[PDB]
Design a protein around this ligand. Structure first.
Ligand SMILES: Nc1ncnc2c1ncn2[C@@H]1O[C@H](CSCC[C@H](N)C(=O)O)[C@@H](O)[C@H]1O
Lengths: 227, 6
């Protein structure tokens, strides 16, 4: 009954990507744009992400470093501004939408001078530098990749982590199956599907947490910390 | 983005 892979829901992969690019090209370069009309939840999100991340910053043998993070599907840099720049000496951003990266230079202000690379690339086409990032943060974008491209992107991210580095995925989760949104050209996957993909990429879960205090009407949101 | 359950 339920679909378990993107190959059951995507009619044409090239159109899946091209429609998403067109969709984001016509979104305003604002927090409300990044958050689909839910700009007001940004502080709830950031506070929770911060607490989640701080778990991994404690002193000890496995402490995650604080030299460099990578914000994936960063948009205008909502997460880079409020979560990552305060904690990491430098941050790189990657996003498909050039207009958002241009706006980021304004949005981020003076602290944005510590954004090193602004990569304008789809994740499916991006190979982060080996041994470069303490944290790779992937939020509200995995639904834009096919299962094969998401698994491969996660493998490339694994190869980019510094010692003790982590990947964080934070995204919408479906109650069951794999659900296409043909307006923004994305999919929403259930927790079993996402865990399968992570496993396929050679990654393991360090922690999984549901986001609390969200509007009742929206898809549930989870965070996963991986290595 | 965060979004309404379809
Ligand atoms: N295939 C792809 N590769 C990289 N970025 C993509 C992409 N498809 C969509 N995007 C980007 O994904 C972002 C989704 S909006 C969320 C922005 C940010 N993660 C935040 O939470 O504030 C947009 O900036 C859009 O340009």
């Amino acid at each position: 009954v339920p679909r378990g892979s993107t190959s059951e829901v995507i009619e044409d992969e090239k159109q899946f990507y091209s429609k998403a690019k067109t969709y984001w090209k016509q979104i305003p370069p604002t927090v409300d744009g990044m958050l689909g009309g839910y700009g007001h939840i940004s502080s709830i999100d950031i506070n929770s992400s911060r607490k989640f991340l701080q778990r991994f910053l404690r002193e000890g043998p496995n402490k995650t470093g604080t030299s460099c993070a990578l914000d994936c599907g960063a948009g205008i840099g909502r997460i880079t501004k409020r979560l990552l720049l305060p904690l990491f000496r430098e941050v790189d951003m990657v996003d498909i939408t050039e207009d958002f990266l241009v706006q980021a230079k304004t949005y981020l202000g003076e602290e944005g001078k510590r954004v090193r690379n602004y990569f304008c690339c789809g994740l499916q086409d991006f190979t982060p530098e080996p041994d470069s990032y303490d944290v790779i943060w992937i939020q509200w974008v995995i639904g834009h990749l096919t299962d094969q491209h998401l698994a491969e992107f996660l493998r490339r991210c694994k190869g980019s982590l510094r010692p003790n580095g982590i990947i964080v995925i934070k995204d919408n989760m479906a109650q069951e199956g794999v659900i296409l949104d043909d307006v923004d050209s994305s999919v929403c996957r259930d927790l079993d599907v996402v865990r399968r993909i992570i496993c396929s990429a050679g990654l393991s879960l360090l922690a999984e947490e549901r986001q609390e205090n969200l509007p009742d009407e929206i898809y549930h949101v989870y965070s996963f910390a991986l290595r | 983005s965060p979004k309404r359950i379809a």
